Design a protein around this ligand. Structure first.
Ligand SMILES: *[C@@H]1O[C@H](CO)[C@@H](O[C@@H]2O[C@H](CO)[C@@H](O[C@@H]3O[C@H](CO)[C@@H](O)[C@H](O)[C@@H]3O)[C@H](O)[C@H]2NC(C)=O)[C@H](O)[C@H]1NC(C)=O
Ligand SMILES: *[C@@H]1O[C@H](CO)[C@@H](O[C@@H]2O[C@H](CO)[C@@H](O)[C@H](O)[C@H]2NC(C)=O)[C@H](O)[C@H]1NC(C)=O
Ligand SMILES: *[C@@H]1O[C@H](CO)[C@@H](O[C@@H]2O[C@H](CO)[C@@H](O)[C@H](O)[C@H]2NC(C)=O)[C@H](O)[C@H]1NC(C)=O
Ligand SMILES: *[C@@H]1O[C@H](CO)[C@@H](O[C@@H]2O[C@H](CO)[C@@H](O)[C@H](O)[C@H]2NC(C)=O)[C@H](O)[C@H]1NC(C)=O
Ligand SMILES: *[C@@H]1O[C@H](CO)[C@@H](O[C@@H]2O[C@H](CO)[C@@H](O)[C@H](O)[C@H]2NC(C)=O)[C@H](O)[C@H]1NC(C)=O
Ligand SMILES: *[C@@H]1O[C@H](CO)[C@@H](O[C@@H]2O[C@H](CO)[C@@H](O)[C@H](O)[C@H]2NC(C)=O)[C@H](O)[C@H]1NC(C)=O
Ligand SMILES: *[C@@H]1O[C@H](CO)[C@@H](O[C@@H]2O[C@H](CO)[C@@H](O)[C@H](O)[C@H]2NC(C)=O)[C@H](O)[C@H]1NC(C)=O
Ligand SMILES: *[C@@H]1O[C@H](CO)[C@@H](O[C@@H]2O[C@H](CO)[C@@H](O)[C@H](O)[C@H]2NC(C)=O)[C@H](O)[C@H]1NC(C)=O
Ligand SMILES: *[C@@H]1O[C@H](CO)[C@@H](O)[C@H](O)[C@H]1NC(C)=O
Ligand SMILES: *[C@@H]1O[C@H](CO)[C@@H](O)[C@H](O)[C@H]1NC(C)=O
Ligand SMILES: *[C@@H]1O[C@H](CO)[C@@H](O)[C@H](O)[C@H]1NC(C)=O
Ligand SMILES: *[C@@H]1O[C@H](CO)[C@@H](O)[C@H](O)[C@H]1NC(C)=O
Ligand SMILES: *[C@@H]1O[C@H](CO)[C@@H](O)[C@H](O)[C@H]1NC(C)=O
Lengths: 199, 202, 50, 271, 217, 37, 49
């Protein structure tokens, strides 16, 4: 795939183009008779050649100031990018980050750094769910006049029975007293259902 | 022309709340000075003041500006002579002999002439004249509210002006004399281009 | 010759990648020169002399 | 720099290639703005549509959900936000993503976050009732699901009352949108100052090049044109430097906004 | 040329209704907005003539030589499958109603692409339509999963440049150096900024990669 | 390059950056997140 | 730029509003420093003793 590494290529191309512009501004005669100091000193007298030397110095000083300002702006941007890359390293390689879409798209598991010319490439290994199936849910279950809520999983029903499964994967386990906790009564949940709870 | 936009300039203007002198007529003609510009106001119950005079050396040695006017048409002439010593207009009731001498002049502008205001300026080569008329309906000092004066004539003349006098007629009067100073001003323009509000930044 | 060659020139390369590139600035050109002046009146008295 | 002329370009060509640098910086800023807009608003993979009947467990999202009862299909809050906030050589380029596209992206984000929680941000959009999503978020913040399943009505009333006051808060306080008002005012004043600098003289005889070319000799008209060119080039350089600084600030703010979107809308940040 | 006012643009009849003593106007930017004809007393507005940069749409020389031009900010009636959009006049590409992904960003929601072959213009497709079947008691639980690896590239540093100020400005000349020494410490400030950038690149490279004290094998 | 402008070599060469990357990789595959704390 | 010079002050006016831009930038930096100091240290609403 092309333009995959375009970020570092853009930086190196900007540096090369800034250098080329700085070296090209040397040949630009800013109002002087020539762009070469040797062609002015060996042709004009000092009191008359100093007028052109002043214009050349002014032009080259302006060019250098513009180049240094652009380099400072680009260095600030590079420092921001490097701080972002260091934070990415510390939060994805040295540990697991709960931040969404920070260490790649999806549930981040781990990341691996890779060296690159004037840059860094992170291989974000993420957890992406697939093959989703929908079932009937219920906020709680009323059994023996008391309401039961899921401890870690969620309540699902395939049409004839009720099970409790984790939120990020389908694992239908029997609804018992260990994976559910009782709180409140039967008449406080608007979507509560009638189902037995094994003991 | 400017519309619905604010503008600022450093031209000559009359400062707000300045110490403008009040001169009532029994004629009171001491030949007031003229530094860079004067603000003239007239609110009497008649048209007794119907002229102005400008110049630097009024003793028949340098050109002078005349704004002689009557109820028909203005007579603007630029000549070099003293009238007698000072203007004195005694009006069948139709007479005009305020000056008893004539010389070589250069201008005969006779195009066209209850509170009336006049602002005169002495820029390098155009004697600017501004005028405006607004009702009063009351008997007190200068009323409130802004009233921008519009340019009337350019009067291209290159004569220096340091003294000015007021022309009064006869067989009581009052007029206000001010002085302009260069300071920054802020002008507000409406949708039609008329100045409605102004702020003296100093 | 053609906009592709103008893009090649403004990029200083014979191979152009996929994208948009600003080559030149277009503007409509003026057609006529109009001189406006007020009424030609108040002629000097040359006739009264000659 | 020159304007309404053809001979001044011959003197401008002696200054080198500053024009190319300025054009490249402006194009970089232009593409950077669209890149930031895409990184902020185009984080969704698909455009999710709201169901016909909402009934989100009592929660009222009419203040933020779009409605076809008025043009531009925007929400009342977005409408109040949009209602609360000449060429002399410079042009304004239209953004790539128009207001309708940004509105559709925001509506898709809202639909995904109200019908799927944080599932659509990590992968496929998993349908989930809004009370169940709120219970999951309460369990995430360290509160049992019983507190929500016993006070759903109270929490819905509180959410509705808090959303209903957002419009009043943003309307009664015009300084709420100050962060965007200052940006648009800075852009407007920068344009107005760049175009006003053409009336300055920088030590020349007149601000109009055609007046200098019709009143002075060539050996002095060229010096006046050179002074005007130097002044206007310094003005352009200052304008481009300020635009680059403001663009870096806007890029930082847009990166922060995209991170906040991904961490708060597409998920539940513990920060 | 109105009584000395020199310019170039479009004159059009307007109703700004200038006052009798004024004959020309300016906007907030001191730019001439309108001028009154000194002959027939008619007031007409002056509008600058259209101008804009030409952006050529190139799908790549390695693919095809066909290109499309875009006159930004102008009308098509003032400039071949001509097309008018909010970004300008598009010439060289036909507009289609089918929506695809934005390949070449043109502007105002319009993008160009090289498809079956000719360049076409179309509106941006934000994404595929997806209506989630929300309900009072419908939950979706995944039954499988996929392990995906996403590549993310971030710059860490750039080229450490060092420029000899006196040598660049003068180039082995003493008469030039005597005048350069008059301007002050500019050659010192630039050198200091360059050295700061140079040490900053190394500091960034150290902070990014060198986050461990032991080289684990 | 001959106009007074030169490029300074980076402190950490490509080999040292590669060694740092390999050390991070070995630590994250053999120790998890424990070596970061 | 001038330092109590009358002739220099009048010539500086022909450069436009560069001084105004510099003053606005300096005031922006000044208010930005205070905004940063407020956002960093004044995050709490009440002074807990
Ligand atoms: C000197 O100025 C006068 C005054 O503007 C010019 O005369 C004007 O000429 C225009 C054009 O011919 C006249 O407009 C026409 O008016 C008739 C009605 O009389 C109307 O039917 C036409 O459709 C058209 O609008 C205008 O009336 C006329 N004004 C006067 C007072 O005569 C004159 O042309 C100028 N001369 C020079 C040499 O510039
Ligand atoms: C829902 O899941 C339950 C649990 O697997 C299913 O019950 C089983 O169905 C099979 C198929 O007829 C029987 O052989 C088992 O004996 C059943 N187990 C029990 C404990 O009853 C049930 O059929 C599923 N319902 C649907 C609609 O898929
Ligand atoms: C769940 O069980 C409860 C308790 O047995 C049911 O409530 C009874 O419903 C019947 C029929 O409407 C009434 O005659 C009884 O008086 C109710 N008992 C009580 C204690 O209220 C309930 O209908 C069952 N189903 C659901 C969905 O809740
Ligand atoms: C305007 O100027 C006149 C004259 O300079 C001021 O009148 C003098 O005021 C002082 C202070 O009250 C008196 O001592 C003098 O006797 C007044 N007359 C003269 C001839 O000096 C007048 O006060 C000034 N008005 C304003 C508003 O400044
Ligand atoms: C009022 O002033 C006008 C001029 O502004 C006088 O009209 C001129 O008067 C002179 C006599 O001094 C005549 O020679 C001119 O021919 C008159 N011009 C015109 C156009 O009529 C007018 O006479 C003055 N009226 C009074 C009563 O003094
Ligand atoms: C009318 O008076 C004016 C004012 O004195 C005359 O202008 C002067 O003419 C003399 C002629 O030698 C010059 O030396 C002066 O320099 C002129 N004055 C100015 C201010 O430049 C004018 O010549 C007189 N006209 C006639 C016909 O005598
Ligand atoms: C959700 O909120 C909106 C706005 O607060 C409610 O719309 C209002 O409904 C009342 C009662 O019919 C009207 O008197 C108001 O004029 C409506 N306001 C607007 C802006 O439309 C809407 O009823 C709420 N939803 C529910 C289910 O109550
Ligand atoms: C989950 O998905 C994986 C693939 O992503 C499935 O693995 C495939 O299973 C089929 C059926 O036995 C094999 O023919 C393929 O070769 C397997 N692919 C791979 C890469 O091993 C897996 O069966 C799915 N699991 C469930 C429960 O649906
Ligand atoms: C599951 O989703 C599909 C597609 O969204 C739908 O056709 C089906 O009826 C849904 N099943 C249940 C039990 O909700
Ligand atoms: C009029 O003023 C000018 C400008 O100050 C001066 O050069 C000239 O000498 C003055 N003439 C008289 C008669 O005062
Ligand atoms: C402009 O003049 C018109 C004349 O009909 C008047 O109706 C309008 O109120 C005026 N506007 C202003 C701002 O004075
Ligand atoms: C272009 O000009 C035509 C005719 O003047 C006009 O109908 C059309 O609206 C113009 N297009 C734009 C974008 O202004
Ligand atoms: C949910 O329940 C409400 C009333 O409790 C009912 O109007 C609606 O049809 C049900 N289904 C959906 C999908 O909202």
């Amino acid at each position: 795939t092309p333009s995959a590494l375009g970020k570092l290529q853009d930086v190196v191309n900007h540096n090369a183009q800034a250098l080329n512009t700085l070296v090209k501004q040397l040949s630009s005669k800013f109002g002087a008779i020539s762009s070469v100091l040797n062609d002015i000193l060996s042709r004009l007298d000092p009191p008359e050649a100093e007028v052109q030397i002043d214009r050349l110095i002014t032009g080259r000083l302006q060019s250098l100031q513009t180049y240094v300002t652009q380099q400072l702006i680009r260095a600030a941007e590079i420092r921001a990018s490097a701080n972002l890359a260091a934070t990415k390293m510390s939060e994805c390689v040295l540990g697991q980050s709960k931040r969404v879409d920070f260490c790649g798209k999806g549930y981040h598991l781990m990341s691996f750094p890779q060296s690159a010319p004037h840059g860094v490439v992170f291989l974000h290994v993420t957890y992406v769910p697939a093959q989703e199936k929908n079932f009937t849910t219920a906020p709680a279950i009323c059994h023996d006049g008391k309401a039961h809520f899921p401890r870690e999983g969620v309540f699902v029903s395939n049409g004839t029975h009720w099970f409790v499964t984790q939120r990020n994967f389908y694992e239908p386990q029997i609804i018992t007293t260990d994976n559910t906790f009782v709180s409140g009564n039967c008449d406080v949940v608007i979507g509560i259902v009638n189902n037995t709870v094994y003991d | 022309f400017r519309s619905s936009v604010l503008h600022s300039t450093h031209d000559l203007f009359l400062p707000f709340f300045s110490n403008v002198t009040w001169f009532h007529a029994r004629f009171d003609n001491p030949a007031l000075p003229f530094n860079d510009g004067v603000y003239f106001a007239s609110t009497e119950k008649s048209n007794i003041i119907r002229g102005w005079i400008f110049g630097t050396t009024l003793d028949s040695k340098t050109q002078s500006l005349l704004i002689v006017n009557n109820a028909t048409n203005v007579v603007i002439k630029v000549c070099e002579f003293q009238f007698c010593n000072d203007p004195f207009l005694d009006v069948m009731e139709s007479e005009f002999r305020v000056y008893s001498s004539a010389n070589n002049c250069t201008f005969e502008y006779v195009s066209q002439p209850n509170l009336r205001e006049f602002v005169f300026k002495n820029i390098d080569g155009y004697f600017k004249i501004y005028s405006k008329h607004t009702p009063i309906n009351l008997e007190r000092d200068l009323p409130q509210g802004f009233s921008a004066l519009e340019p009337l004539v350019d009067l291209p003349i290159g004569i220096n002006i340091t003294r000015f006098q007021t022309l009064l007629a006869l067989h009581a009067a009052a007029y206000y004399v001010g002085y302009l100073q260069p300071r920054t001003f802020l002008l507000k323009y409406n949708e039609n281009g008329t100045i409605t509000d102004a702020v003296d930044c100093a | 010759l053609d906009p592709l060659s103008e893009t090649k020139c403004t990029l200083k390369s014979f191979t152009v990648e996929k994208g948009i590139y600003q080559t030149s600035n277009f503007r409509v050109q003026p057609t006529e020169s109009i001189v406006r002046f007020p009424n030609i009146t108040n002629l000097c008295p040359f006739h009264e002399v000659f | 720099i020159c304007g309404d002329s053809t001979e001044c370009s011959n003197l401008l060509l002696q200054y080198g290639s500053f024009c190319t640098q300025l054009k490249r910086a402006l194009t970089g800023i232009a593409v950077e703005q669209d890149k930031n807009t895409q990184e902020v608003f185009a984080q969704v993979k698909q455009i999710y549509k709201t169901p016909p009947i909402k009934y989100f467990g009592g929660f009222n999202f009419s203040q933020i959900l779009p409605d076809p009862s008025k043009p531009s299909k925007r929400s009342p809050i977005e409408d109040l936000l949009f209602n609360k906030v000449k060429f002399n050589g410079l042009t304004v380029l239209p953004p790539l993503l128009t207001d309708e596209m940004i509105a559709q992206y925001t509506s898709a984000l809202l639909a995904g976050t109200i019908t799927s929680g944080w599932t659509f941000g990590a992968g496929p959009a998993l349908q989930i009732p809004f009370p169940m999503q709120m219970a999951y978020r309460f369990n995430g913040i360290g509160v049992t699901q019983n507190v929500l399943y016993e006070n759903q009505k109270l929490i819905a009333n509180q959410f509705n009352s808090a959303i209903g006051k957002i419009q009043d808060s943003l309307s009664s306080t015009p300084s709420a949108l100050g962060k965007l008002q200052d940006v648009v005012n800075h852009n407007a004043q920068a344009l107005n100052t760049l175009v006003k600098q053409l009336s300055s003289k920088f030590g020349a005889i007149s601000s109009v090049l055609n007046d200098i070319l019709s009143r002075l000799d060539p050996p002095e008209a060229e010096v006046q044109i050179d002074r005007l060119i130097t002044g206007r080039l310094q003005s352009l350089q200052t304008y481009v430097t300020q635009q680059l600084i403001r663009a870096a600030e806007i890029r930082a703010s847009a990166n922060l906004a995209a991170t906040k979107m991904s961490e708060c809308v597409l998920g539940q940040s513990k920060r | 040329n109105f009584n000395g006012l020199t310019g170039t643009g479009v004159l059009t009849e307007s109703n700004k209704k200038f006052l009798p003593f004024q004959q020309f106007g300016r906007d907030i930017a001191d730019t001439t907005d309108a001028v009154r004809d000194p002959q027939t007393l008619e007031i007409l507005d002056i509008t600058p003539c259209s101008f804009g940069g030409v952006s050529v749409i190139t799908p790549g020389t390695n693919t095809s030589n066909q290109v499309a031009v875009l006159y930004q900010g102008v009308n098509c009636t003032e400039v071949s499958n001509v097309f008018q959009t909010r970004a300008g006049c598009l010439i060289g590409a036909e507009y289609v109603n089918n929506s695809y992904e934005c390949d070449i960003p043109i502007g105002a929601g319009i993008c160009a692409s090289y498809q079956t072959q000719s360049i076409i213009a179309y509106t941006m497709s934000l994404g595929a339509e997806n209506s989630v079947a929300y309900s009072n008691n419908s939950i979706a639980i995944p039954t499988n999963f996929t392990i995906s690896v996403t590549t993310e590239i971030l710059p860490v540093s750039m080229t450490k440049t060092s420029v000899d100020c006196t040598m660049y400005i003068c180039g082995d000349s003493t008469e030039c150096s005597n005048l350069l020494l008059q301007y002050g410490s500019f050659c010192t400030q630039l050198k200091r900024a360059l050295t700061g950038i140079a040490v900053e690149q190394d500091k960034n490279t150290q902070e990014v990669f060198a986050q461990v004290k032991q080289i684990y094998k």
